[PDB]
């Protein structure tokens, strides 16, 4: 599924990402746009051998288990083929685990370079 901007914000806010670890809601929406284009099924295979899955591009070497990725830690205790749902529950829940503090969104390079310090609230404006 491909989410709309306000559809994703509303979903994410219900799931408690609004201000999670002092990260305002626009941060997460901004990160999803660049990472997955709001596409719950985006998958991108990395030259490092891992693959990134879902609306939040969760990694197969560290956070989820795809079965084809050597050195698999699967710290979110969830198969990657579960992070591709139309419900974002599994993806939000793994994101909550990944970001353990106020530097945690730096887990997404796209957020780091594109969204950090900009007017992220722009992303929820009108919702």
């Amino acid at each position, epitope marked *: 599924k*491909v*989410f*709309g*901007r*306000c*559809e994703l914000a509303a979903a994410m806010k219900r799931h408690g990402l609004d201000n999670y670890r002092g990260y305002s809601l626009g941060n997460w929406v901004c990160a999803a*746009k*660049f990472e997955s*284009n*709001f*596409n719950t099924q985006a998958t991108n295979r990395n030259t490092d051998g891992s693959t990134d899955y879902g609306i939040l591009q969760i990694n197969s070497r560290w956070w989820c288990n795809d079965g084809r990725t050597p050195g698999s830690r699967n710290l979110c205790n969830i198969p990657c083929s579960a992070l591709l749902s139309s419900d974002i529950t599994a993806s939000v829940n793994c994101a909550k685990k990944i970001v353990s503090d106020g530097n945690g969104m730096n887990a997404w390079v*796209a957020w780091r370079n*594109r969204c950090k310090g900009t*007017d992220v609230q*722009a992303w929820i*404006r*009108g*919702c």
Partner: T-cell receptor
Amino acid sequence: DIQMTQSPSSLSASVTITCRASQDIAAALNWYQQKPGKAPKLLIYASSYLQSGVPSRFSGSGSGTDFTLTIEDFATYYCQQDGYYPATFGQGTK
Amino acid sequence: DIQMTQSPSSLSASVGDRVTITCRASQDIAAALNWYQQKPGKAPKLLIYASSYLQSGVPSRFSGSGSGTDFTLTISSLQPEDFATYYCQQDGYYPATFGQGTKVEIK
């Protein structure tokens, strides 16, 4: 798709446009101005947030499903909702 | 803002021809680039989302590619109903910005 119906479709006028969404879009409604064979230019974001450079005679209003743009400026005007996939435009007012 | 440069400005070709339109963003916008089709008398309509995702009902002769700064829309078999102006639009940074458009005509 969320259908954006503008009215009226055309207007003659010498030196108020409506847009209606089929579904509740809250305030996620943008206004665009297009001159002939030119690209659309964004005038208003999120119902009423004017873009920098756009004069104050252009104001915007509304929430939910019924919205208004308020008026060199002979052009087509388009509403566009960008809160729900796929982003859609109304058919325009000339 | 981000400045989109689109080319060519117009083109004309024959039924069945392959045609390609390019869009260059003034900085890296990843895949946050859409293509709109505006038929005469009509509003712009989303044809391709995020560089390559075809919208439903759009025929498979249309496609798009690119990620970063340079993007392309290809019509693999031009048809008379494609008579339109095509716009790229980056929607990754506020405010959303359009290319200048490409009028496509069919002999």
